[PDB]
Amino acid sequence: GSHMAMAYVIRDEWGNQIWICPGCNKPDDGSPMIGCDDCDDWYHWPCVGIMAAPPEEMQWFCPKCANKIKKDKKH
């Protein structure tokens, strides 16, 4: 069973998922959020360095999944 990943998850007033971006360790405190192409969860703009909304054709990966890209990407 998952012992971890129980946190970084808060419920909103309406019951929405408050994502705690594992990049900064902040929840949505009122920022624009961006989701990964490999993972399901959402990160924030300042954490990853988003200047403006990136293309959808582009596959965007957080510092976590960028590390999966690693160096040697085969995609």
Which residues in 31-70 contact Zn ion (CB under 5 A)? Answer: 36, 38-39, 44, 47, 62, 64-65
The DSSP output letter for 38 is S
Closest to Zn ion by CB, 13 or 34: 34
Smallest gap from residue 58 Cβ to Zn ion (A):
14
The CB density around residue 54, as the number of other CB atoms within 10 Å, is 13
Longest dimension (CA), the chain: 42
Q: Between 1 and 20, how does the x/- string for binding to Zn ion read (CB under 5 A)? A: --------------------
Question: What pairing do the DSSP bridges indicate for beta strands 17-19 and 9-11?
Answer: antiparallel
Structure tokens at 69: 């890209």
Residues forming the site for Zn ion (CB under 5 A):
21, 23-24, 26, 36, 38-39, 44, 47, 62, 64-65
